[PDB]
Design a protein around this motif. Structure first.
Motif, PDB file in Angstrom:
ATOM      1  N   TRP C  35      57.891  10.218   3.275  1.00 31.97           N
ATOM      2  CA  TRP C  35      57.474   9.341   3.277  1.00 31.97           C
ATOM      3  C   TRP C  35      56.147   9.145   2.033  1.00 31.97           C
ATOM      4  O   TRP C  35      55.286  10.074   2.347  1.00 31.97           O
ATOM      5  N   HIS C  36      56.032   8.099   1.364  1.00 33.33           N
ATOM      6  CA  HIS C  36      55.116   7.956   0.407  1.00 33.33           C
ATOM      7  C   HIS C  36      54.418   6.483   0.269  1.00 33.33           C
ATOM      8  O   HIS C  36      55.127   5.511   0.421  1.00 33.33           O
ATOM      9  N   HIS C  37      53.082   6.649  -0.123  1.00 31.30           N
ATOM     10  CA  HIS C  37      52.169   5.287   0.086  1.00 31.30           C
ATOM     11  C   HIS C  37      51.912   5.004  -1.177  1.00 31.30           C
ATOM     12  O   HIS C  37      51.474   5.879  -1.925  1.00 31.30           O
ATOM     13  N   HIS C  38      52.396   3.743  -2.072  1.00 33.19           N
ATOM     14  CA  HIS C  38      51.727   3.631  -3.444  1.00 33.19           C
ATOM     15  C   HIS C  38      51.110   2.348  -3.345  1.00 33.19           C
ATOM     16  O   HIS C  38      51.453   1.194  -2.801  1.00 33.19           O
ATOM     17  N   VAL C  39      49.908   2.147  -3.899  1.00 31.57           N
ATOM     18  CA  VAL C  39      49.041   1.310  -4.244  1.00 31.57           C
ATOM     19  C   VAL C  39      49.146   0.940  -5.751  1.00 31.57           C
ATOM     20  O   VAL C  39      48.704   1.816  -6.423  1.00 31.57           O
ATOM     21  N   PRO C  40      49.740  -0.007  -6.247  1.00 32.57           N
ATOM     22  CA  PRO C  40      49.924  -0.324  -7.791  1.00 32.57           C
ATOM     23  C   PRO C  40      48.350   0.048  -8.440  1.00 32.57           C
ATOM     24  O   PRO C  40      47.651  -0.649  -7.945  1.00 32.57           O
ATOM     25  N   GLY C  84      49.499  -1.714   1.188  1.00 36.64           N
ATOM     26  CA  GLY C  84      50.197  -0.990   0.215  1.00 36.64           C
ATOM     27  C   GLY C  84      51.557  -0.881   0.320  1.00 36.64           C
ATOM     28  O   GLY C  84      52.135  -1.424   1.467  1.00 36.64           O
ATOM     29  N   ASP C  85      52.476  -0.312  -0.465  1.00 38.16           N
ATOM     30  CA  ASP C  85      53.824  -0.201  -0.193  1.00 38.16           C
ATOM     31  C   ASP C  85      54.075   1.410   0.360  1.00 38.16           C
ATOM     32  O   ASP C  85      53.584   2.316  -0.127  1.00 38.16           O
ATOM     33  N   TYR C  86      55.211   1.320   1.117  1.00 38.64           N
ATOM     34  CA  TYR C  86      55.528   2.532   2.043  1.00 38.64           C
ATOM     35  C   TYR C  86      57.147   2.617   1.558  1.00 38.64           C
ATOM     36  O   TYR C  86      58.000   1.775   1.789  1.00 38.64           O
ATOM     37  N   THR C 104      58.385  -0.872   1.957  1.00 40.25           N
ATOM     38  CA  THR C 104      57.667  -1.986   2.986  1.00 40.25           C
ATOM     39  C   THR C 104      56.305  -2.173   2.568  1.00 40.25           C
ATOM     40  O   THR C 104      55.595  -1.235   2.588  1.00 40.25           O
ATOM     41  N   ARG C 105      55.946  -3.573   2.369  1.00 42.32           N
ATOM     42  CA  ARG C 105      54.828  -3.580   2.054  1.00 42.32           C
ATOM     43  C   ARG C 105      53.810  -3.978   3.338  1.00 42.32           C
ATOM     44  O   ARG C 105      54.346  -4.968   3.884  1.00 42.32           O
ATOM     45  N   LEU C 106      52.665  -3.309   3.587  1.00 39.52           N
ATOM     46  CA  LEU C 106      51.960  -3.383   4.811  1.00 39.52           C
ATOM     47  C   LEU C 106      50.700  -4.120   4.361  1.00 39.52           C
ATOM     48  O   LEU C 106      50.189  -4.065   3.458  1.00 39.52           O
ATOM     49  N   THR C 107      50.419  -5.152   5.198  1.00 41.39           N
ATOM     50  CA  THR C 107      49.418  -5.985   5.193  1.00 41.39           C
ATOM     51  C   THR C 107      48.646  -5.961   6.505  1.00 41.39           C
ATOM     52  O   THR C 107      49.008  -5.840   7.686  1.00 41.39           O
TER      53      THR C 107
END
Lengths: 15, 208, 212
Positions: C35-40, C84-86, C104-107
Motif C-alpha cells: 500500500w502507497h500514499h500519494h499527495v500530488p 490524499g490517494d491510497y 482511493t481518495r481519503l478526506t
C-alpha cells in the motif's frame, strides 16, 4: 523464461 | 537502503529516453528493481522489473516492445530505456526495490514539441495591505524558482503553480502581501531562476 | 487482470477508516500486497509491504491484511495529514505483472469552508510597451478546492484568450488557482473594463480593472 516467472511467483507468494 | 535516480528529461514524440537507478550503498546480491510511473492526475502504473544479479527481466503486455531494462556488473544498478515516446508518456518515473518497500525519488519525463525558452518577467505593481507580484511569462521547460529580496522576504509570499498554455509554454505568477506603508519604505524585487535556460532575472516591482 | 478500489473514503478526525482492494485468485489471493500514499506534489510513500509490514518510520495506526481475493488497509486516529490517494499493489501470476488499484481518495471531514480571495492585476506598463497584454487573476484560500472562472469584457463574456489553472493545495490546507486573459494592447484600451468572476459553492466574487 518460464523459469524466471516461476522464481517471481515464489518470491511474491503469500498464502 | 535508498535509491538515487538520474535527472529530468525533455523529449520530442517519437524519441527514446534512458533512465538510471542506483542503490545508495552496498547490497548482498540483489532481489529485483521495479519501474513504476505516475502521469499527472492519474494512478500508478508498473513498467516492469529486472534482477540486477542475473539481468532477467519481465514487462507487462502493455509495454512489451517499447522498453528495454538493462543492468551492469553492479548488484543494484538498473536502467530503463523507453522508446516511441508520446504525449501520454509524460510522467514521473520511479524505481523501487523488490518488495516495493523502498522507492527512488522520481524523475520527470516531459514529452513536448516545445524548445527551451527563458521567461519574460513583468512587474505586477501594487496601487492596509497591498498585493504585489511578478508575472513569469512564456518559459519552457519547468521548473522556475522564485524568491523575493534574495531570500529575506518569505512571509506573505505565494508563488502559484504554472499554467501550461496551448502553445506549450508555461507561465506562473508570484505575489507578496505587504503592509501598505512599507510600499514607501522598502524595495521589492523578485528573483526568478530558470536553470533549464541558464537564466536568472531580478525584477524590481515599483508602486503605481 | 485488474485491481479495484472504492473511489473515496471519509471520516471525521480521530475515527478509523478501512480501504478495500479487490483482485482475483491469481493475484491478491496468493501474492504479497503493498500500500502507497500519494499527495500530488510529492513522491508516493510506502505504508505497507508484504501485506502487513510497516516500513521503518511509518506510524502504527496503519495496518494491512487480506481475506481471499480482497486486501484491506486500516487507518486509525485519522488526521489531516492522512488525506490524499491510497493505492494497493500486488503480483499477478497469470499476467506475470504487478497490478495497482485505481486508488482511493481519503478526506478528513469537518474542515471549515472558506470563500476565495481574488486579486486581479491589469497589464503592466512594461508588457504593453512590448505590445502584449495579460490580465492576471489570482485565487487563494478557498475550501473545498474547486472553483469556476469566467472573464468579461465590459459586460460580455470573453470566449477567447483564457487559460486557467487547476486548484492546488497550500500550506494551510486550503486551495489556490490562477487564470490568465491574453489581449492585444488595442483590445485592452478600447473597452471600459475587464472582469474576473470566480464561482465557489454556487456564490460568486467578481473583480474588475480598467485601462484608466
Amino acid at each position: 523464461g518460464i523459469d524466471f516467472q516461476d522464481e517471481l511467483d515464489e518470491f511474491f507468494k503469500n498464502v | 537502503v535508498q535509491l538515487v535516480q538520474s535527472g529530468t528529461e525533455i523529449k520530442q514524440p517519437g524519441a527514446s529516453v534512458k533512465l538510471s537507478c542506483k542503490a545508495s550503498g552496498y547490497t548482498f546480491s540483489s532481489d529485483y528493481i521495479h519501474w513504476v510511473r505516475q502521469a499527472p492526475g492519474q494512478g500508478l502504473e508498473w513498467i516492469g522489473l529486472i534482477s540486477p544479479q542475473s539481468g532477467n527481466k519481465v514487462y507487462p503486455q502493455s509495454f512489451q516492445g517499447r522498453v528495454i531494462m538493462t543492468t551492469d556488473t553492479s548488484t543494484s544498478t538498473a536502467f530503463l530505456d523507453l522508446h516511441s515516446l508520446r504525449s501520454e508518456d509524460t510522467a514521473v518515473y520511479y524505481c523501487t526495490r523488490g518488495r516495493l518497500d523502498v522507492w527512488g525519488p522520481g524523475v520527470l519525463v516531459t514529452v513536448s514539441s516545445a524548445s527551451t525558452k527563458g521567461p519574460s518577467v513583468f512587474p505586477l505593481a501594487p496601487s492596509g495591505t497591498a498585493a504585489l507580484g511578478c508575472l513569469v511569462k512564456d518559459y519552457f521547460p519547468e521548473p522556475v524558482t522564485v524568491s523575493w529580496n534574495s531570500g529575506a522576504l518569505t512571509s506573505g509570499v505565494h508563488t502559484f503553480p504554472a499554467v501550461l498554455q496551448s502553445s506549450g509554454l508555461y507561465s506562473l505568477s508570484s505575489v507578496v502581501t505587504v503592509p501598505s506603508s512599507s510600499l514607501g519604505t522598502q524595495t521589492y524585487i523578485c528573483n526568478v531562476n530558470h536553470k533549464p535556460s541558464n537564466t536568472k532575472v531580478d525584477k524590481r516591482v515599483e508602486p503605481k | 487482470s485488474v485491481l479495484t478500489q472504492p473511489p473515496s473514503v471519509s471520516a471525521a478526525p480521530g475515527q478509523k477508516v478501512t480501504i478495500s482492494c479487490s483482485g482475483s485468485s491469481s493475484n491478491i489471493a496468493r501474492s504479497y500486497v503493498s500500500w502507497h500514499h500519494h499527495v500530488p506534489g510529492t513522491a508516493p510513500k510506502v505504508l505497507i509491504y508484504g501485506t502487513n509490514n510497516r516500513p521503518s518510520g511509518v506510524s502504527d495506526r496503519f495496518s494491512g491484511s487480506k481475506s481471499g481475493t480482497s486486501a484491506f488497509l486500516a487507518i486509525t486516529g485519522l488526521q489531516t495529514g492522512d488525506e490524499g490517494d491510497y493505492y494497493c499493489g500486488t503480483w499477478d501470476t497469470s499476467l506475470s505483472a504487478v497490478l495497482f488499484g485505481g486508488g482511493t481518495r481519503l478526506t478528513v471531514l469537518g474542515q471549515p469552508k472558506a470563500a476565495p480571495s481574488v486579486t486581479l492585476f491589469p497589464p503592466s506598463s512594461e508588457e504593453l510597451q512590448a505590445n502584449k497584454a495579460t490580465l492576471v487573476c489570482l485565487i487563494s484560500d478557498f475550501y473545498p478546492g474547486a472553483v469556476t472562472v469566467a472573464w468579461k469584457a465590459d459586460s460580455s463574456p470573453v470566449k477567447a484568450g483564457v487559460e486557467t489553472t487547476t486548484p492546488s493545495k497550500q500550506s494551510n490546507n486550503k486551495y489556490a488557482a490562477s487564470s490568465y486573459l491574453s489581449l492585444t494592447p488595442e483590445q485592452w484600451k478600447s473597452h471600459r473594463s475587464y472582469s474576473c468572476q470566480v464561482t465557489h459553492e454556487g456564490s460568486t466574487v467578481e473583480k474588475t480593472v480598467a485601462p484608466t
